[PDB]
Amino acid sequence: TRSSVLADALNAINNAEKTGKRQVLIRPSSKVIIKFLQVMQKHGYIGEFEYIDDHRSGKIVVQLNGRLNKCGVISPRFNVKIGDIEKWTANLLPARQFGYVILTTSAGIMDHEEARRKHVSGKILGFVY
Template identity: 40%
Template sequence: MVRLSSLNDAARLGRKNAVIRPSSNLVLRFLEVMKKQGFVENFQRHGGHTPGHITVEITDKLKKCVLLSQRFDTKSRRIDAWARQILPAPEVGHLVITNFLGVMDHREAKKKNLGGRILGYFY
């Protein structure tokens, strides 16, 4: 199981870089969503096909980042209920959802009227 505690620690301590071990394609897609929302500036995978590590440059916006170990299924009409339950405020943060179109945040999934599995969240 990949833990993103190094991102939380770096954000709390005011650091700009963090290292995530081990790397996986799912974590890379999670980081792509974070980059699209402006919480991560850049990231790079090291180690090729072996479980290496990912170097991440974070921004000052990041407060907390969690990759859930249990994936919760949700329908598109229940996404707002999950967001109210997990996120600290209505317009703060993003749920990361995976479905057959890929990995996206909850606002994009709601706009496309898609459900999926909740991977995690960040704010």
């Protein structure tokens, strides 16, 4: 069955960028997909995204510009320490200048830089660069 919904969303985004289009049809929604795309939007990695209601569970349109070479999901949501942030920041990012790890923390969902300077941690979702 459809196990994760964020995984199929981000896989659809990555496939539609690797074929070079400018728009997707993400289906279905969640809190997690909406807040994940808001985290991409606050860094300006995607443009407009748009949420369509249908009373079942909504389909999302994301108008992606060109700026995302790869986002992804880490599907076993591992528990990460404060000191374990450097390991995921070294393993999945390109280098130490850019590149983000997205966590669910009890203060909310935030990137790895915001989880460093929040001084909290949580469970890992994925990564946007």
